[PDB]
Symmetry: D3
Subunit: 157 residues, 6 copies
């Protein structure tokens, strides 16, 4: 283990064998603000009026501006970035789904569940772990879901 | 706004966006926006330990900006259902420049909706070496032309 | 990148951008970006004592966002020379929504630049009531299509 | 600019103009610092707090509070530190703050005879005139 | 009061006190890559001349150039002052983009009270033109504009 | 989230945060957030004339970021009363990387709160050379178990 992580409270090294199927964690919450809409637009270059024009949004089903899909994804994932596992590599995501729209003033939390574990066909010293991520709003409704695929080092001899 | 119905999507149609250089500011803004300050992205000293020896962009940043580059016109009769097979193919470093290729990759009927079809838009983000750094299949549910 | 040569600009052509609501965020970002935190812009209590009773939008913010709304139309053969008659016309309140109307107001030969022409694009920033809040004449130096050799 | 040590006058008070603390400022402060604690960032959680709404980060009230005094920054004063920084009252979205700076003390230093200690008492006040933050700024000033 | 000073939130300056020929030069501010990225984010303008370093190699100076609205906004911002209750800011004339600004250039703004004129429709006010010139670290003018004020005459 | 009561704090316990490189972006964002654009921080040409020859970070930025690095796990049972002895020890420059060392420095009975105690957490912001650049004593009022 790199000396960096010595004395780091937020570091939890979990090797492939020690991931527990069914383990669940839930993040703290974050209210999605009009600032977040404007920051996301400026960061990504997406200024579509569905996100940025309160007058146009009155004509939409639902009558209000809706958050960019990539914002709910980025923030939902970002909420999980508290504990670092230095032995896990982020390979990608499967089945990213936009389940419900998110509006200004909604508050989100992310639930992360260890879903599946398999051998890595390419690397014998690693395994694959799927973390199911569910972003939930203040009504307890899923607004986004995705399966995060991690390539996790096996524990050393 | 340009209404494009299911039947008008052309399998194999491709567009490539303009380029955007990914800067250290983008790393710092992404961390600030998302809450992800992991040292692989934010600590230049720690990042010397990575195979590239330098900080790597968040996967969600390359996704968000990659997709953002394609946000040039809206189709009011296409619903963004989700993405399949999002892959972080190669790291992106400060100073790399990305462009996004969007391809109409597949079209299928929708089992539940006879009034709509599914269109898969393949999104491939490429760097200044012409290498794919991120790929994902965008799933759209697109209404059929009336009558 | 869509190229339009001088001769293809159509006198009197009008285009209108998509809209964008001017938010309190935009005020705070503009103040932070430009260094202008004076209380007529940034102090809601003091602003109660001003004509109108509300924080006053930075003129440069309405200009920068107003022009920014037009950015999708990229003309690589046009050089931005400057602007004439930048006018601050009406208040813009937090929550107002703006669009920019761009009209080809004038085309003229430029004697200093034989391979180019001058195009004036009148830009009018309009609010949700259709009122002009800011106007400016954008001066473009636009390349002519290559001089042909006429046989 | 400049104010030499002898030019400071104990008891002098300066009151800044105001700045309204916005939701933007909360979100920017979290992004800038990495502090996303739910007291600041989660309006549902914040309903459980005594005020029932989100409260500004102490470091934001400090940074913006001190920033209001910037047009008055003396280039001949080394900023040594602060004593007795206190988070007196919460600041909510939409509150407006001003900073009151009082020259609280001047003392000769046993380490530099060619300089003196100046203490500037800083009080951030809200639109109700209530102190929300206080701190003693220690300056080492050229004699 | 020597012992209690309240910073103003406004400051009245009548026509006669804009003294023609008066010059002021602001402090400097280095224009950074952050400023380019923030400006694009703020305005929605991501044009490759400003945002694509590879594309910019093909341009005459070989590098990204600042948005005109950025140099204007920051240049004016450097000069920002207290609201003047007796002056109306009409807008600007003859805004010119004189030279490109690159990442790492440092700018200051020079404001000269350039011309004063009577107003035929307003005997109790007069027109004041403030010539604003944004200069870079070499002292070259990169942007110029004439700020137009209508200012009440002293009672 | 982790609840730690007064008795649970261990005199002398030490932790170090993750690190963060202080970038030019952080300087620009700090100025934009605080309204302080003074040339020592924001003018690279002027800064050549200063003793170090380069722009120096705002004290309030090193404090805000240095403390922010510690904000990874809420203790709901602790109240943030203030800080003593905030000291600006060394300048921080663009490209310096900081992390924060947090030490439980002192524990004592709260004079007026029977059901709480007082904990001092010394925060030392440390650069890439391991040098302390900023120190502050975070004063916590912590509920008894």
């Amino acid at each position: 283990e790199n000396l960096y992580f010595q004395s780091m409270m937020s570091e939890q090294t979990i090797y492939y064998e020690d991931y527990e199927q069914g383990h669940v964690r839930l993040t703290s919450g974050r209210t999605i603000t009009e600032t977040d809409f404007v920051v996301h637009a400026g960061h990504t270059g997406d200024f579509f009026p569905h996100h940025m024009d309160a007058e146009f949004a009155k004509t939409l089903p639902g009558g209000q501006r809706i958050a960019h899909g990539t914002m709910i994804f980025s923030i939902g994932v970002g909420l999980t970035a508290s504990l670092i596992n230095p032995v896990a590599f982020s390979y990608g995501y499967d089945r990213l789904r936009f389940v419900r729209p998110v509006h200004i003033g909604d508050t989100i939390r992310t639930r992360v569940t260890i879903a599946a574990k398999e051998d890595d066909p390419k690397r014998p010293g690693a395994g694959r772990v799927v973390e199911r991520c569910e972003v939930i709003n203040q009504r307890g409704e899923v607004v986004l879901a995705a399966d995060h695929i991690l390539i996790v080092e096996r524990k050393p001899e």
